[PDB]
Amino acid sequence: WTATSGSCKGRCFELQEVGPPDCRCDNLCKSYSSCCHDFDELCLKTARGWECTKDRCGEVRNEENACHCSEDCLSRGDCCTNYQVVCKGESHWVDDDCEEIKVPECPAGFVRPPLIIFSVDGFRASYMKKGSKVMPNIEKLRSCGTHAPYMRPVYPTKTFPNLYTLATGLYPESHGIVGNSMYDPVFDASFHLRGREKFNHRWWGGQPLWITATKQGVRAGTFFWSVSIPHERRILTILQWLSLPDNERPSVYAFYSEQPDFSGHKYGPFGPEMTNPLREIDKTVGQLMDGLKQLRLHRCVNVIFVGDHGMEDVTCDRTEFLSNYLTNVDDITLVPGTLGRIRAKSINNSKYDPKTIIAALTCKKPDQHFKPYMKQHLPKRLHYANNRRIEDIHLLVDRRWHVARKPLDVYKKCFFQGDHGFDNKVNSMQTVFVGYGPTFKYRTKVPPFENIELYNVMCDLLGLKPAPNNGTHGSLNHLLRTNTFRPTMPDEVSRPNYPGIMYLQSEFDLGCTCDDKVENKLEELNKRLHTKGSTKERHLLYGRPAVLYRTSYDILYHTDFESGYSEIFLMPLWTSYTISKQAEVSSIPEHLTNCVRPDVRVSPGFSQNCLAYKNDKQMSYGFLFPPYLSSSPEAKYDAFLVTNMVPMYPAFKRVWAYFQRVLVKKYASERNGVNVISGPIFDYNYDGLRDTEDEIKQYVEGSSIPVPTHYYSIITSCLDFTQPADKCDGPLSVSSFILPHRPDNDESCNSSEDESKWVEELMKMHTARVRDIEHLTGLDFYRKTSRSYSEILTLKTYLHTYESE
Ligand SMILES: *[C@@H]1O[C@H](CO)[C@@H](O[C@@H]2O[C@H](CO)[C@@H](O[C@@H]3O[C@H](CO[C@H]4O[C@H](CO)[C@@H](O)[C@H](O[C@H]5O[C@H](CO)[C@@H](O)[C@H](O)[C@@H]5O[C@H]5O[C@H](CO)[C@@H](O)[C@H](O)[C@@H]5O)[C@@H]4O)[C@@H](O)[C@H](O[C@H]4O[C@H](CO)[C@@H](O)[C@H](O)[C@@H]4O[C@H]4O[C@H](CO)[C@@H](O)[C@H](O)[C@@H]4O)[C@@H]3O)[C@H](O)[C@H]2NC(C)=O)[C@H](O)[C@H]1NC(C)=O
Ligand SMILES: CCCOc1ncc(-c2ccc(C(=O)NC)cc2[N+](=O)[O-])cc1C
Ligand SMILES: [Ca+2]
Ligand SMILES: [Ca+2]
Ligand SMILES: [Cl-]
Ligand SMILES: [K+]
Ligand code: NA
Ligand SMILES: [Zn+2]
């Protein structure tokens, strides 16, 4: 019930929300059907339009007008945005030459530069170049302020997931808004774009910027606008709030625009009908900037121009139907569109089986335009699994396509020419970032970054302390003139042991053999110094990684490679080696094919054994440092040490062997040498965090050798590839992957072909940030470089996407 009989007289767009059943006048009252009777009349005036004309100049104040051209309007803070241009011979903001803003130039009373977030739905990254002729305001913001070629949204590339990520710094799996449409098994409730349930506070986790600000004593304008409030009214409202007395005036504001997304759904991302929407957005920007300039706030305010996702071409004829794959199509519910989410229609059906559903959706048609996944098998870079609201079965849909249940769902619902929601590495999904103001840099391009990073910066811009989030704080310092947050390296928790020769061959009963029984003063001093660390400067280029948890491990040195060996997991946590441009691939000689050697530095009780692998019919084994790249026939023996061994499914061995034998050498040639750090990952509870011992769901049969869920590699070289990896003087260049450790290659539909036809494709899909690898291993890389910590932070958050230009 709402008792809509109160009034909005002097309450228009009140900042505090009044409690039911009293009537409301907040910018969200229309969406709850709870505005006072006189809201439209008093608060949504439209009389005479949005612009001053020559004849309105110096007029008599008529309170009915939407905005004013009277003499007293500047004091009232309620002029039309063009008042000074029309009536005082001033010029539009866009027509002024841009001058650097070395310091905030604010009116007296301002405790800090305010922040305006200008959000534009569906603003594809390419619109910046492709629409530059029709967006002079936006283009001035971009070229005078700080900008990125594009900003990467989060998956799923939808509105609410992305706007709430901006607001919180969190992955959707952590903030809860994991789609535009959701079911929560625990609440037994559903979340839709239409309706009431989307307003209930239990869906929304984390701590959004407006709450972060309020708790720390910074006042916030209300971020949301009811859909029927015209854009011009939103701008005038923000401008009005900026005129308030120092004690009531907010420090952070938000504007949202439904365009260009609304039009892009109808016309496609580049429909000729798209030029007008891009013009209107620019005009709106102009109005804001002209309004700020009237109030002397245009060299005081920080403006963030930001999109939620891009837009792709999608039509009805490009829809795949699950009814062409499944018989039991009515025992299932599907969340449809640019992503698939399948669950049972009824929990009382005990015959429904996810296993056979996946199988039935796997590589069934030669051109298939979606791929089924158990959520835990989705690429780790998507961070899309650890939430009860994400269904166990997910369909990653090809760019340009749709997935629906039955064909009736499509025609009983062609309407659209555009859509979005695909994998967030897809070019057409990229969106924009521009920052303009005294705290941002002047005329500066920065590299592409991810939207999870903005929350921290917005907090820096406001003098706030961020709530714990998934940004990496300091990784976007290069955006800022000042107010930079100065981060320290996390402290190492566990210090390594450095074991020497402590055990005799005969103490090992591992069930391993090696043909290593063939027999000098010059060359024996040489191997000693290698096992103490004479080549360590060569293979450990950026320091040893720090172990940020409590554990027991050993550093092991060798001619060709260095490792941190875990006595708890019985394998290395990491192995580090450098392959230079000139290095040569060799084979595994016949006599050493099944050779596994005891490591005399590590006790039998902390080693694996061959018998476990013999007795396990499913599991085989592999090596972290590849024997193929041994520097000499003698060094090659080191690669067969039981401490270099890790568990591998024969299906995964095909992947790993091709990566080690072919791809490593390929990258060394292309990149002028590479440093490689490789290791196992354990994430049985799919939270993106390193599992402790008691979380491991699978061991090698009849042993305590734990099975990794993934294998990573970090490949580093010099950004200036004229300098070889091992002698680099400048910035570094990195790419990484987190390969799922799977007993079959069902994910790659071409896996019965030669490895050169599918392997590198799989690796690309599983590309990763070093930071992803850090969360999953509890290690901290790049501890000793000649580079600044902020710059390293940026490097760690880099993602190599393999998307073209
Ligand atoms: C990205 O960044 C985020 C933010 O930093 C990272 O997530 C954090 O990770 C922490 C570790 O996983 C986690 O800490 C836990 O806190 C638990 C209490 O949680 C409440 O309080 C927080 C803080 O205010 C709040 O944010 C939470 O809100 C969640 O839950 C509701 C729904 O229930 C949602 O509204 C909201 O969206 C959010 O959901 C998300 O997070 C939770 C994780 O808590 C997930 O379950 C959801 O799927 C969703 O993703 C909560 O209101 C606390 O209970 C935990 O403590 C247990 O474990 C410790 C280990 O130290 C142990 O000592 C304790 O015994 C305890 O175990 C007991 O309970 C167990 C389970 O019932 C049981 O098995 C045991 O036997 C014990 O009885 C834990 O310390 C922190 O909450 C989240 N924060 C957020 C916002 O998600 C994230 O890791 C980052 N991602 C990456 C990849 O780096
Ligand atoms: C810094 C990000 C601010 O966070 C947000 N900003 C705007 C919205 C929002 C979403 C949809 C619509 C709409 O009209 N859809 C038809 C309107 C608004 N709105 O006006 O607020 C949501 C959020 C979380
Ligand atoms: Ca959107
Ligand atoms: Ca985990
Ligand atoms: Cl969705
Ligand atoms: K085996
Ligand atoms: Na296959
Ligand atoms: Zn949309």
Swiss-Prot record:
SUPFAM superfamilies the UniProt entry points to: Alkaline phosphatase-like, His-Me finger endonucleases, Somatomedin B domain
Cofactor note: Binds 2 Zn(2+) ions per subunit.
Tissue localization of expression: Abundantly expressed in cerebrum and cerebellum. Localized in secretory epithelial cells in the brain and the eye including choroid plexus epithelial cells, ciliary epithelial cells, iris pigment epithelial cells, and retinal pigment cells.
EC number: 3.1.4.39, 3.1.4.4
Residues that, per the record, bind Zn(2+) 2: D261, H265, H420
Main location: secreted
GO CC annotation terms, alphabetical: extracellular space; membrane
Catalytic site: T159
Cell attachment site (motif): residue ranges: 76-78
Function comment: Secreted lysophospholipase D that hydrolyzes lysophospholipids to produce the signaling molecule lysophosphatidic acid (LPA) in extracellular fluids. Its major substrate is lysophosphatidylcholine. Can also act on sphingosylphosphorylcholine producing sphingosine-1-phosphate, a modulator of cell motility. Can hydrolyze, in vitro, bis-pNPP, to some extent pNP-TMP, and barely ATP. Involved in several motility-related processes such as angiogenesis and neurite outgrowth. Acts as an angiogenic factor by stimulating migration of smooth muscle cells and microtubule formation.
PANTHER family noted in UniProt: ECTONUCLEOTIDE PYROPHOSPHATASE/PHOSPHODIESTERASE, ECTONUCLEOTIDE PYROPHOSPHATASE_PHOSPHODIESTERASE FAMILY MEMBER 2
Name of the protein in its database record: Autotaxin
Provenance organism: Rattus norvegicus (Rat)
